Amino acid sequence: PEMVRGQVFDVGPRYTNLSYIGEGAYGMVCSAYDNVNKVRVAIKKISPFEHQTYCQRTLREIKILLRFRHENIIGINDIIRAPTIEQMKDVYIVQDLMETDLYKLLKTQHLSNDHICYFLYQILRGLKYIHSANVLHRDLKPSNLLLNTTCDLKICDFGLARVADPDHDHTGFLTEYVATRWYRAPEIMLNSKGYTKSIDIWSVGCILAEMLSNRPIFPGKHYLDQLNHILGILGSPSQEDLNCIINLKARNYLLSLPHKNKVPWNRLFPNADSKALDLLDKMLTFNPHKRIEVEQALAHPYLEQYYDPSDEPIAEAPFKDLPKEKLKELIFEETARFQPGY
Template structure:
């Protein structure tokens, strides 16, 4: 099968409307596909994120949460939604198409393919912390910061994406931390989430940023745990064992 045939096969059910000319598939995830495209009326290059969330209530919640938050934020280091393609009829509303800024790559790909200079690391982490300050000032926890969620372009501009797990820092739900443990990416997960503390704070995002910075500098993950127990072992090997006060703060029987 030729390259064009493979592309046509992957885009067979990609219906973003007549205003957009699809160029290529730039990413795929558990419940969505991202394509680069051109907005025909303006010639602007954009990214179109197709989400098919309606098979699972959790995906619906994540999609709604991401749309609400990204429509709220207006920050140069947070990805923005330019438009949402409306379905022609209610019966055809089986997919969601988000039109977003087009970025060329992500931090995960960059780290895997090249060494970063200290100047690059400094500039990238500066932009990440600018975005984090904006989120935390709005009492929003991202909860899934990792290299693949830091989008980059050739000018070294950085934008944080994927707010499907984000939530208010004031949100109170005794099961929320428990659920996050099984969804958020383990290598960048703060210990208090793995230990299912009853409450956690904005510090969980700061932990993730620290792990990302270490990976930028070394070119490899700081705590690449194989499973839950191995992850904690790697962390304790570096940071030492917790104090008794911390120990008694652990509520999980596991």
Template sequence: MDRNFRVGPDYSIIDVVGEGAYGVVCSAVHEPSKQKVAIKKITPFDHSMFCLRTLREIKLIRWFSHENIISILDIVKPPSLDEFTEVYLIQELMETDMHRVIRTQDLSDDHCQYFIYQTLRGLKALHSAAVLHRDLKPSNLLLNSNCDLKICDFGLARSAFMGEQEATGFMTEYVATRWYRAPEIMLTFKEYTKAIDVWSVGCILAEMLNGKPLFPGRDYHHQLTLILDILGTPSLDDFYAISSHRSRDYIRALPFKKKKPFAQLYPNASALAIDLLEKCLTFNPKKRITCEEALRHPYLASYHDPDDEPDSPRSTLASSISITGRNS
């Protein structure tokens, strides 16, 4: 990955702080203001799909102005079209992410409450604008030393309202890092809803409680096996909610499994944490708790303030991010 940043004299690069499939993130100083920032270098032009995701991410982040969603302070582009091989997003600098925090320290119950509350607060802003994040995981929750949390990485985000042709590509796309994927993504329910993000929040909460991923599947089949090992065999109602006959046949062929109580898996967690966990990790997406309901859950009562959990307008956003190619 090319780590040469061509961002002009206004920015002095400090260090590389992260690296992904088609981007590098550096810490830097904005010399005119002396503000520390993060610069995300994106080189998406090898594949049209990456271009679409980059454009979608920029449009989404610039739309939202929310304390729990990462913002773009500036965009630096090359001086000419001939040199247009990368884009630089100037963003707020956050010291770490949830993945690193979970790996290096035990979290108190109060930390878990505050981090999940902020995640849901940001997610409420997305969902109220009819946007699904689709890739929530610990590494996409950025943190600073004040324990402020911001959701990042909107390259896979999509509108919840799509035409039939768009939905076809949406269904077949690789959605969410496997360990945090809702079962309906793998079992081809009739449609994916905001509930897929709530499932991911449940997986993140579980990981906060004991420092280990709840469903670390090696592949598609192992992932489903791990989920059913804990949630148990789906009820008849939940079974017939799966539209794919192939998926139903797959589950029917599996041995019957009893549900494992989350209280036994997380003996040190509070009863309220366990209750929220169960509601987020409900197999049937129609029965799963919504983001708004989760914010009102007693586990988050210390932080919940309905007057300080703003919605986002959605009238033009849904159409503005419908920039799709097949499997984009």
């Protein structure tokens, strides 16, 4: 069995000539030569079975990626695992090799307005599909937007995804949250569990801002700091927006802050296309009920050269506490289609 950094990475005989990429979110990633399709691919080794949280996230990711089929969403090409539950200790997920990601690109490359426009279009087209499936991604950020050498953009990492549940979105002030801090919507810190589509649009708006300047717009260092970054640019919420926040601790926190005026986008982003900044404003709207929706964003004048709703498909099959032993069996079942025979 082939080794990579002295750990087993046994994908053969189909996958050979391995090169290390990284130590992943949790699990090692290599490129490898696919000897069937005659192209290099990406492979991630996952070893989740001792922990119910890792079983849950792995199962969730696999079920979603296998159900989805869209040019702006990473697909699963193959899944390698043992023929029996008892022998199954790792799972290998095979994807198209994506040479970079928006995180890497932003650390080194100035993006043209044409690239920003194209990347935003692709993000929203993929997101239209995800949301049409009643799914929230909940961890959109540059490193979760993969790109290949022709700049095809594919959303990945559905580990924190959920079925949308607006009727159970409410919670109290300072309720703990798991998704990446810099791309969290203001309401997460105030009164939201992140079970509405508007959570994802905020993250997209953060990404657009980042594309414009190569720097995160709201780099908070700790839970409440993230909200305070947001308010520093958007300015104090209006009375009407505060009236929407019934929770007293959340509303009173916002009323305790000194009045702060809006920082105009065109001062933050003096080289930006004016239509890009109009769309940015609408995605980075404090009130989630007033925030633009994905399909509305696609129809925005900024994207008019790409907008084509007939070429922006929706999902055919929208989605509607298990011990790790049951989750292992479900992962075994979910990966069965890739085993030799059919």
